[PDB]
């Protein structure tokens, strides 16, 4: 039995985030934190050595007497968003047991919000459109559509890395003949509505 935080952890960028994981067999010898994006495989984040481990923002600790390992992420960044797997060998064997995972989502620090809702025309001439709600800060949340035949994506953070500019956006669209962007992005923030 390997047990870790149920999660999820939803923290603002910059926050310290603490994970803890407990293992039931005292004889267990090898301990790891693995990380996993949603459509990917487990990759090793750090082994947890007898003295623990340190790597930049990341610290791990082993308390063998109490039978737990810890992971501490300081000054968390958007790139830390992933699922964190606790991993401990089945006592007195090479087989590994994986915990159920803790989902971490780090929200981007948006300092220059400029919330706006824009309409965008298809590049192929079909007079079809989508709606873009963008440049809002990470304290704005986006709810699923409450209307059938209306579609609203969750928010999504893009990173114009060359310059250190992030920005949030969500997409909405509908085939309903009178659909207008305000019908999906109803009152949420003070956006410029062109």
């Amino acid at each position: 039995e390997v047990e870790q935080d149920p999660g999820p952890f939803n923290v603002p960028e910059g926050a310290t985030v603490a994970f803890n994981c407990t293992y039931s067999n005292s004889a267990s010898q090898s301990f790891f934190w693995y990380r996993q994006d949603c459509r990917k495989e487990p990759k090793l984040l750090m082994s947890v050595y007898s003295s623990g481990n340190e790597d930049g923002r990341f610290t791990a600790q082993l308390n063998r007497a109490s039978q737990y390992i810890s992971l501490l992420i300081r000054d968390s960044k958007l790139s830390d968003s992933a699922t964190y797997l606790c991993v401990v060998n089945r006592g007195s064997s090479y087989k590994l047991i994986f915990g159920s995972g803790t989902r971490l989502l780090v929200r981007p620090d948006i300092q220059n919000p400029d919330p706006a809702v824009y309409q965008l025309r298809d590049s192929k001439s079909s007079d079809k459109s989508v709606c873009l709600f963008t440049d809002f800060d990470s304290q704005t949340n986006v709810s699923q559509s409450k209307d059938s035949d209306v579609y609203i994506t969750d928010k999504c953070v893009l990173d114009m890395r060359s310059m250190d500019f992030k920005s949030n956006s969500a997409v909405a669209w509908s085939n309903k003949s009178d659909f207008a962007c305000a019908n999906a992005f109803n009152n949420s923030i003070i956006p410029e509505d062109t």
Binding site: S100, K124, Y151, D154, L158, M160
Partner: protein, 238 residues
């Protein structure tokens, strides 16, 4: 690293599957895991060389696996159930530390007639965003696809880009009520206003869809939904 084939597979319930894995060269231990959305990897079988050391967790009379020569290994599900939809992970090791392959995402579905390729459209940046922000967000829409086995990528002048992109982590069900609902997926690419206004810059949104093969019987009036790429494109505009 560890290699696995395929990356995605759609099968009808009752059919069989195979998953192939190739350890890191010389690794004596090989592991298969099932991982369903929300949980960790769970072991199904360990081989140490070509010897089956622990198959106690191997479900029932539907899961088998072979590592006949102690190198690569084949896991099989026969026949398959909808509850088998999961990612199947392969990992190899010498000692404790395991190294994973990229996984095979499995979706088992009632009826292969539920399978549809995506349709892809690119929506051009708003003139109002350009003047308000000096930037240009293009949006890509993949709609109507099933299963949720796609890879969406952005290409600028023949060239794949990652900066200024984000693609929804999860698709939306176009009919949440239904179990076989088709899916939609949006992505954005953001560039500078100057870059978008240059009419020699070429933008393409590419969606790789994993579907049926030439070996699948098909009798719907639409064409077989084979694994394919569907894309849409736009040039910058002055």
């Amino acid at each position: 690293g560890v290699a696995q084939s395929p990356r995605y597979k759609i099968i009808e319930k009752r059919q069989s599957v195979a998953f192939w894995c190739n350890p890191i060269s010389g690794h004596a231990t090989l592991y298969w895991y099932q991982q369903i959305l929300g949980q960790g990897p769970k072991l199904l079988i360990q081989f140490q060389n070509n010897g089956v050391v622990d198959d106690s967790q191997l479900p029932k009379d539907r899961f088998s696996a072979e590592r006949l020569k102690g190198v690569d290994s084949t896991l099989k599900i026969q026949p398959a159930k909808l509850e088998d939809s999961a990612v199947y992970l392969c990992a190899s090791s010498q000692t404790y530390e395991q190294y994973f392959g990229p996984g095979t995402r499995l979706t088992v579905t009632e009826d292969l007639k539920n399978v549809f390729p995506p349709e892809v459209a690119v929506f051009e940046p708003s003139e109002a965003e350009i003047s308000h922000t000096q930037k240009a967000t293009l949006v890509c829409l993949a709609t109507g696809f099933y299963p949720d086995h796609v890879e969406l990528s952005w290409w600028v002048n023949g060239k794949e880009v990652h900066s200024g992109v984000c693609t929804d982590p999860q698709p939306l069900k176009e009919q949440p009520a239904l179990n076989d609902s088709r899916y939609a997926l949006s992505s954005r690419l953001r560039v500078s206003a100057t870059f978008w206004q240059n009419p020699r810059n070429h933008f393409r949104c590419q969606v790789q869809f994993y579907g049926l093969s030439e070996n699948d019987e098909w009798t719907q009036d639409r064409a077989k939904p084979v694994t394919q790429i569907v894309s849409a494109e736009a040039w910058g505009r002055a």
